[PDB]
Design a protein around this ligand. Sequence first.
Ligand code: MG
Ligand code: MG
Ligand code: MG
Lengths: 210, 97, 126, 156, 78, 60, 116
Amino acid sequence: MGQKINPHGFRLGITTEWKSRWYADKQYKDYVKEDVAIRKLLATGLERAGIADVEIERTRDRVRVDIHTARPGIVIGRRGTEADRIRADLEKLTGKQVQLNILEVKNPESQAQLVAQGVAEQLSNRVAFRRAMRKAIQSAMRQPNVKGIRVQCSGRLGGAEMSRSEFYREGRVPLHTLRADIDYGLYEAKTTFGRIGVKVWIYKGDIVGG
Amino acid sequence: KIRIRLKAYDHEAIDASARKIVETVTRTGASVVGPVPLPTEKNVYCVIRSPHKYKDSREHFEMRTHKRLIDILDPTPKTVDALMRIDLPASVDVNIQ
Amino acid sequence: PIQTVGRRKEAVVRVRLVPGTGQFNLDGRTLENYFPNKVHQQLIKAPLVTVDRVDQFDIYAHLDGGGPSGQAGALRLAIARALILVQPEDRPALKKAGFLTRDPRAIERKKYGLKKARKAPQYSKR
Amino acid sequence: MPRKGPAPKRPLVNDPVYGSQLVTQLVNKVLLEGKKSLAERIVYGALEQAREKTGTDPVVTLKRALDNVKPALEVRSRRVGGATYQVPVEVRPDRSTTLALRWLVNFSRQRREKTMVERLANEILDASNGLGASVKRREDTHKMAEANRAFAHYRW
Amino acid sequence: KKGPFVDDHLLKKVDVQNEKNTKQVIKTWSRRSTIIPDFIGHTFAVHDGRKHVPVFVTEAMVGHKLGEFAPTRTFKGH
Amino acid sequence: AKKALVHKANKKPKFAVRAYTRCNKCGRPHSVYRKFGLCRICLREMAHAGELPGVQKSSW
Amino acid sequence: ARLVGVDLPRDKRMEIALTYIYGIGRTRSNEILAATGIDKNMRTKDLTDDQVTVLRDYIEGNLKVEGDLRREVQADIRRKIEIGCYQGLRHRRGLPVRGQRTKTNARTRKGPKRTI
RNA sequence: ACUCGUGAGAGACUGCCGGGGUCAACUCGGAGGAAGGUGGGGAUGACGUCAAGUCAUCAUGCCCCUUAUGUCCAGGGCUUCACACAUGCUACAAUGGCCGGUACAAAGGGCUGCGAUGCCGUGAGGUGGAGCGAAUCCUUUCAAAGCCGGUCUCAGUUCGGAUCGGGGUCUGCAACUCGACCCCGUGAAGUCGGAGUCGCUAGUAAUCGCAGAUCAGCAACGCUGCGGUGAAUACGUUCCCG
RNA sequence: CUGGGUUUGACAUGCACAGGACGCCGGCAGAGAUGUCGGUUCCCUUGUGGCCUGUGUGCAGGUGGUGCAUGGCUGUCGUC
Ligand SMILES: [Mg+2]
Ligand SMILES: [Mg+2]
Ligand SMILES: [Mg+2]
């Protein structure tokens, strides 16, 4: 809706980190190719399982993936049926092995991406988007080491035709302040009528992080 | 003049490279130089994303490329080898002037 | 020995004031070979013209960066600082002319989408 | 500055070989986008030619010409009550000197002679003698001011 | 600059023509051999599948296709 | 745009006339700009991720 | 003076006076004078008959006469127009031959700016 | 002991005094000070209008094509033209043109790329290698405006360089339609421009060149950064527009 | 755009009929696509995994439309 710049995309080298931290001469192309291929492969699985961030690093001809799952148990089921299955799928789709190592998050309500995934799933489950956003804000403000939140679900809300963008906020969510350490989440929900956008902001605290 | 007109892709990367160079040369025990103040520039990147009618919201989004320099004099083959043995970051595309 | 520093937009200079005969030995070039515009001569003499010590003190400067006018201003600032450190009583005689301080006026950072700094593109009405 | 207050006058040092703030201002005005030394040499040659022609002090002759061509009244245009009036207002010394120097340099560039040095020398000589384009423009401005004097009662 | 489609036959024909220095038209059969520098303005009567038109090759024509001076696909509309 | 065609078109081709783009990421012979040798999709993906050498979009 | 059929200026240097010929200009005259052993700072009012003759025969031997070059340009133009090529078509239509802008430019070849 | 391109600290916080102001914010002057009253300059673009730009970055509900509107190939076109509009370069002449001799700036393009000395060349350049994942190497131990000498005598000209013809070069297999550059000749408009209108408040305008984004090869005079030399005005908001 | 090809298509994937040859380097007819010929004939191991080759199948493919349906990005107003 607005022209506000992505805080993560702006502070990718000041406050926030990078999801792809590697370097290669003439091979960065193939590196990012394999990265986006793995991302597209894990999209459906880790979305049905709950995903926050997929940090991929490149080593001497091998890979180092770190996926931040929210609900462990769906993707990690029986040892040799789901995890090893997806590992073998990634390996046979790429030209190398995969030493997959999952890392569990500390609080799903504290991560912006997870809150966006949850609110989008709620909206797609044929529920009141207003109540869904309210409960998500309550969960994310129930003292998860946070100080502010701002949730927005744009697009064709309620399966209507008008692009209603409900602006819901709570606490302190400054965008012009650099010393914010604000987490951002951008999600695209698919419905039977079209697409919907979910923009979330979680101002955890005023930590410098220098 | 000499040493140097180079360029890097990340401020963190280039400052870490300068720091590790200073550390390795000081561990070899040779010497240091006198830094001087000089700012950086803004690279030339105003590329479009689509050949369609995107001529509103068009110009650019600056790619911050901060660069630092460290001058040196009175060569010594030992320092030459200690500096040319390896480069930890390898992402700073140094160019000789 | 006493030594000071002078700075400019993109230039630096270091001098060592000592007594003797007035001269300016630059980095490999002499006074007339380094200041051919005939205005930078007067500019760098102004610090030594307000107080008549042109042919009384020496100037052995070493500079780097900038152009003719920048080097002239840097050498003027260096001579001003040297006179401040040597003869405090003559400090007002140099401050009255607009010396002893580096002019904050310098080259700014050019803006994007424009031709030059503080210059919008020309466009005709429609 | 604009709508804030006046500007601080540059504490420029007098010219070393002439020592005249008016001469330095004329040099800064005739300066052609960075041609500092060139303009200095041009004005020096023009003053030397004027000296060889007259036989007196170049600075004194230039000051006399400036005082003789100084416009004592410059017309303006102000809308008061939905009606334009060309009321003449008292000009200041600095503004009058600047306008005089502007007219002088303009008529010197307009003069058709061999070189710019000779053009400026002849312009200065004509301004000092009282028969020149600068003096003609000064007289025209004075006549316009005397004709428009009918409307001067505001002093706002 | 690797070995181009020089049409070795035409190349040797032009070489012998240059050696003997006899200004005459050379009846060619290819249409994509204007590369090797050995062709010292040797007038090639090109075969566009219909007939042979005598056209002398020029400096700006160096490089272009042999049968491309005039429109090989004869078509005007009127 | 498969591995075989990519390997056949990247090295010395049979006829020199075959000098098309033949991108290395997607492999499509056309619809790719030789300015960067990449198809628009991955080109802009890397541009947004901050990996391609110097491509960006609106800020003014 | 009379050199090959054209008159030179009255008071001008040799390198600028020899430009009146359709086949000689500044640098060409400079090279001719350097090859013949004549100075270039001489005016066009102190020439000798021997120098005139030597320069005439030298230019006739190395280069060709002004009329030669004129009618040669004419013959080459008409030949390239008769062969029926792109250059000939452009020369017939009054359009540039080197293949440059023709939308609004090319007035130098199309004549005055006409609008109809 | 000398300019602290890597880290931190100090220094601007109306710090103090006076006229003030409601002895509340806040204004002016003064002392130290590099900056004195958000220091000079940017990143930082709120709710929203233009049913704003994008379904050709990508996804995208719906419709449509499928022996086709999917895909390759050889040629042509996007670069065409009797005209008009927009943005830039060349200038229109002596603060000038040409020749010879001369000084400092920051910014790097480099691995199938940069490439100095030499051979010979009017000159692109044919020979080529010491040296480079980064100061031994071009962009020089760095340019133009800038300074000294000679000449042109103020004119459609030694100003301006376009069209055009002849002699060539850099790339790649392929340069009139299909780049750029060099040598010779050819020497047109342009004499600072009406009605209208644009940008500029100090390192700003002006003027000068350097470098780069992509290319094996350039339309690149454009777009971005850089600095060389560097001006005049600032009664005031009656007044044109927001 | 002109004309010749490939058309389960240049390019992904599930379900069937035969395979060990596709895949690699060159020659011939053409502007080339394309067709053809010559040197190699799989790696596992009997259940078949990978490969494409010809025939079917769901489909790929659309730079085709619809920003008066959207996601995301952002322009003047306005750095007011
Ligand atoms: Mg519309
Ligand atoms: Mg004239
Ligand atoms: Mg359309």
